[PDB]
């Protein structure tokens, strides 16, 4: 049968809504989108050539176009280029420790591209922030959005910035003449979930 009046709505996954979004999140307040009930054609991504990083963990590109998953989650944010290496299982650094932490047993892909043309400004882009101070490291996929003043000394802060009392987020301040490692990179992390449940995300 061919029904046009009420068609089959299950089509290719809307990766464009994630990868080509105009607004991207700060890494401390990283964005998550749930992908479900669609066909995941990953070859639009695989052979795109526009990416600086395309690293897969526990899964292989070109094989992604096969097999099913329960759901896919897509996390997205901006970091500097020299921090992309921290978006990997088992890494350390300000980003992995205080902002976005992958689990050791991660199954998924980490994709990044240089966004200097969109995300830097002559006077500095102050919209993208990262967490610089935290009392302990994040657990995997933990997301800390606190703005509480960090007590860096023996004197209490009572909610006011001052000596040894720091606002915990700092701006990257991207400017277009930065060296490549200090330029902004947009990052998408695709995590593949497999439960004993109906699969809703399948390849073609």
């Amino acid at each position, epitope marked *: 049968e061919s029904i046009v009046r009420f068609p089959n709505i299950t089509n290719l996954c809307p990766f464009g809504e994630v990868f080509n979004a105009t607004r991207f999140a700060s890494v401390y*307040a990283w964005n998550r989108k749930r992908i479900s009930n669609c066909v995941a054609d990953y070859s639009v991504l695989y052979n795109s050539a526009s990416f600086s990083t395309f690293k897969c963990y526990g899964v292989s590109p070109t094989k992604l176009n096969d097999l099913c998953f329960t759901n896919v989650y897509a996390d997205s944010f901006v970091i500097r280029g020299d921090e992309v290496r921290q978006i990997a299982p088992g890494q350390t650094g300000k980003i992995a420790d205080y902002n976005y932490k992958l689990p050791d047993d991660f199954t998924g892909c980490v994709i990044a591209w240089n966004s200097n043309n969109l995300d830097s400004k002559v006077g500095g882009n102050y919209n993208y922030l990262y967490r610089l101070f935290r009392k302990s490291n994040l657990k995997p996929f933990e997301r800390d959005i606190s703005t509480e003043i960090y007590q860096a000394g023996s004197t209490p802060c009572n909610g006011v910035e001052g000596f040894n009392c720091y606002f915990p987020l700092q701006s990257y301040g991207f400017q277009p003449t930065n060296g490549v490692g200090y330029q902004p990179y947009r990052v998408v992390v695709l995590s593949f979930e497999l439960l004993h449940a109906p699969a809703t995300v399948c390849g073609p």
Partner: antibody
Amino acid sequence: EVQLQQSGAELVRPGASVKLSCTASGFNIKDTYIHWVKQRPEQGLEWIGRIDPGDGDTEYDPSFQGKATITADTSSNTAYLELSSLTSEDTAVYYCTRFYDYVDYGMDYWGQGTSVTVSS
Amino acid sequence: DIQMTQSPASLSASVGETVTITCRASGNIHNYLAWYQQKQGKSPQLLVYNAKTLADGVPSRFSGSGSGTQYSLKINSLQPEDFGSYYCQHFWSTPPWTFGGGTKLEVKR
């Protein structure tokens, strides 16, 4: 610390509208989703809906579509619940909470509640 | 959508006793389940998430278990601060993030 400070108790007549508020401190509401929950007297909790203050997007339980309108003011870090065409079934305590749907472990921070009483 | 029910509606137990309360989902929620405690006149507080993981600041005498559609909250060696109401809530798939009807735990004497 995180705090969700809700507006005070309301006593209103059937047919009226009321707008409740929740002012957050310790985080920016644009960085999460703000949810509202109803609890009728001696009754259970009911999820009303949520807003994403970063882009305005809302979702509601079908039973509250139209009755409830959730908005946010990021400049003052405040979320609002407007309830329209009030009836006695709307008498309840209303709570605001924070929950970033597919990330957070549960609804960790709640306001103190706002009592709404509808009566003639 | 998933509907949530709890049992018993009310239970009396003595300080020092152990109790088990139950949450049942209308369909399989794959451990995407939270428990809350609510004291009279206060807001709910998160106790357990992912069915079995205790939230920060919760005593280890609480334990969550279960699978599929049936979940349990066990309280070992009840203390006076434990009496109150308990609610479950699922986070499976998409909203609504529905709550169970609640269980009221009272003191037996």
